[model samples]
Target: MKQLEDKVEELLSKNYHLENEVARLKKLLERAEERAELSEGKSAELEEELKTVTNNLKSLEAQAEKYSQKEDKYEEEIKVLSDKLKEAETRAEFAERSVTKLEKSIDDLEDELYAQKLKYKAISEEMKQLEDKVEELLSKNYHLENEVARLKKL
Candidate 1:
């Protein structure tokens, strides 16, 4: 009868050890699940951060493209204005030369006109002298003929 009591005591001890091992396994499982939840939250934060960085990169790319277009437009305007300036300068030089040639021609024409005026005045004075001399010769001839007639009559 006392041997039956010993066997009962041993069976109870083995059951307590099995219950403790099961409890320890359950605790380990709960800690592993908490770690998984922590890792998931940190991974989500990293994903959001990567998305924001990608958006910033795209924004910078857009700004750079717009600035490059503006720069090219200004460069084209400067090129056009520079070409126009050169053309205007070239035209001004040619016009200056033409104006100088015209001025010299005007001076030459004025000089020729003055010389012709002096020649005309000299010819007019010579014509007046010739007319006076012819009048004096005719009057003298008439007087000499009258004298001849009077001597013949006497």
Candidate 2:
């Protein structure tokens, strides 16, 4: 009966130790569960951040595509305007040459008119000298005819 009582006391002591160990394990499990919850929240936040970054990248890519299309349109417009400018310049040069040719033709016509005017002036002077000589000859012929009539009357 004494040995049985000692065995019973030992069993009780072992039971107490097992209870303490179970309490400690329960506390450890609680901490681990809390840590797991915190880690899950952090992972969710990181996933949200990644989603936002991906959206931003997509938005940037869309804006770049729009800008590239605008740039192509601007370049095409520039080329068309440049071609028009070249055409305008060519026409202006041709007009300038035409004007020069007209000026030269006018100068030639003016020279021809001056030469004709000089010729007319020389012909007018020659006609005046001939008229004077004809008047003198007519006066001498009238006097000679009157002297012959007086001789016939005698």
Candidate 3:
């Protein structure tokens, strides 16, 4: 009877040690599960960050394309403006030449008018001298006619 009681006590001590070890293992498993959950949460956050980065990259690309189109449009406008400026310069040169020609023509007409006025002044002076000579001849003729009539009466 004493040996059986000793054997029973040894078996009970072994069972108690096994129960404590199982409780320790259960605690370790719970800690590992918690760490896994945290890692999953961090992975979700990283995925969201990657998605936001992708969206931003797409937006930047679109803005770059829009700016490129605007740059092309500005270049075209500059070309057209340059062409118009060249044409305007050509027109201005032509107008300048026309103005110069008109000025020369006006100068020539003025010289002609001055020459004509000088000729008119000379003709008017000659006409006045001829009229005075005609009046002197008429008076001499009248005196001669009076002397002839007195001789006839004598």
Candidate 4:
């Protein structure tokens, strides 16, 4: 009967040790589950950050394309304006030459007009002198006619 009592005591001690090991294992499993939840949350945050970065990259690419198109349009406008400017310069040069020729023609006409005025003045003076000479000749002829008549009567 003493041998049987010793055996029962040994069995009870072993069962108590197994229960303590099970409790420790349960606590460790709970900590592992908490770490897994934290890791899932971190993964979701990283995915959201990646999505935002991708959207930003797309926006930048679109803006860059718009600026490139605008630059091309601006270049075309500059080319057209430059061509028009060259044409305007050519017209201005032609107008300048025409103005020079017209100015020369006006100067020549002015000189011709001045010469005509001088000639008119000279002709007018000569005409006045001739009129005086004609008057003197007429007076002399009348006196001579009177003298001749008197001689004839005598």
Candidate 5:
């Protein structure tokens, strides 16, 4: 009877230790489950971050494309402006040449007008001299005809 009691006490102690160990294992399992849940939450956060990063990249690419188009447009505008500037310069040169030619023509016309004025002055003086000579000749002819009539009466 004493040996049976000792064996039963040993078995009871072993059962109690095993129950304590099972309780500890159950607590560890619960901690492991909590850690897994935390990891799942972190994974969801990382996924959201990745999604945001992807969206940002897409937005940046679109903006870059718009900027590229604007850059091309500016380049074309610069080229067109340069061409127009060259054309304007050519026109300015042509206008300057035309002004110079017109000035020379005006000078020639002024010289011709001065010569015509001198010629007109000389013609007026000659016409006045011819009129005086004609008046003198008519007076002499009238005196000579009266002397002839007196001779005939004698």
Candidate 6:
């Protein structure tokens, strides 16, 4: 009976150790489950951030496309304006040449008018001298005629 009692006491001590190990294992498993839950939350946050970044990138790309279109319009406008400027310059050059030609023609006409005036004045002076000579000759002839008539009556 003494030997059986010792054997029973040893078995009871072994049982107590197994129970303590199992409790420790259960606590460790619970901690591992909590860590997995936290990791899953972190993954969800990262996915949301990635989605936001993608949306921002898309917005930026759209803005860039609009800017590119505006740049093309501006370039076309600049080209049209440049063509108009070239046309204006060509017209200005033509006008300048026309003005120079008109000035030359006016100068020629003015010279002709001055030459005609000088000719008219010279002709008028010559006509006045001829009229004075004719009057002198007529007066001399009239005196001669009166003297002849008196001689014939005597």
Each candidate's TM vs. the true structure?
0.65, 0.84, 0.73, 0.73, 0.77, 0.79
By TM-score, the best candidate is: 2
Q: Could you report the Cα RMSD, in angstroms, for every candidate shown?
A: 3.8, 2.3, 3.5, 3.2, 3.2, 2.8
lDDT of candidate 1 vs native?
0.98
Model 3 backbone overlap count: 0
Per-residue lDDT of 109 in model 3: 99
Expressed as tens digits, the lDDT of each residue in 44-100 for candidate 4 is: 999999999999999999999999999999999999999999999999999999999
Q: Candidate 3 — what's its lDDT? A: 0.98
Candidate 1 wrongly placed segments (more than 4 Å): 1-36
Model 5, 118: alpha-carbon shift in Å? 2.6
Give the poorly placed runs of model 5, Cα more than 4 Å off.
Answer: 134-154
lDDT: worst 10-residue window of model 2: 131-140
In model 3, which regions exceed 4 Å deviation?
A: 1-14, 134-154
Which lDDT tens digits does candidate 6 get at residues 1-154? 9999999999999999999999999999999999999999999999999999999999999999999999999999999999999999999999999999999999999999999999999999998998889989889889889889888899
lDDT of 2 by residue, 1-154 (tens): 9999999999999999999999999999999999999999999999999999999999999999999999999999999999999999999999999999999999999999999999999999998998888988888889889999999899
User: Is candidate 1 or 3 superior in TM-score?
Assistant: 3
Tens digits of per-residue lDDT for model 1, 1-154: 9999999999899989999999999999999999999999999999999999999999999999999999999999999999999999999999999999999999999999999999999999999998999999999999999999999999
Instruction: List, residue by residue over 1-154, the lDDT tens digit for candidate 3.
Output: 9999999999999989999999999999999999999999999999999999999999999999999999999999999999999999999999999999999999999999999999999999999998998889999899899999989999
Worst 10 contiguous positions by lDDT, candidate 5? 135-144
- List the global CA lDDT of all models: 0.98, 0.97, 0.98, 0.98, 0.96, 0.97
Total backbone collisions for each predicted model: 0, 0, 0, 0, 0, 0
Alpha-carbon lDDT of model 6: 0.97
Q: In model 1, what is the error at residue 60, expressed in angstroms?
A: 2.5
Stronger candidate by TM-score (1 vs 5): 5
Q: In candidate 5, what are the lDDT values of residues 1-154, reduced to their tens digit?
A: 8999999999999999999999999999999999999999999999999999999999999999999999999999999999999999999999999999999999999999999999999998998888877877777778778888889899
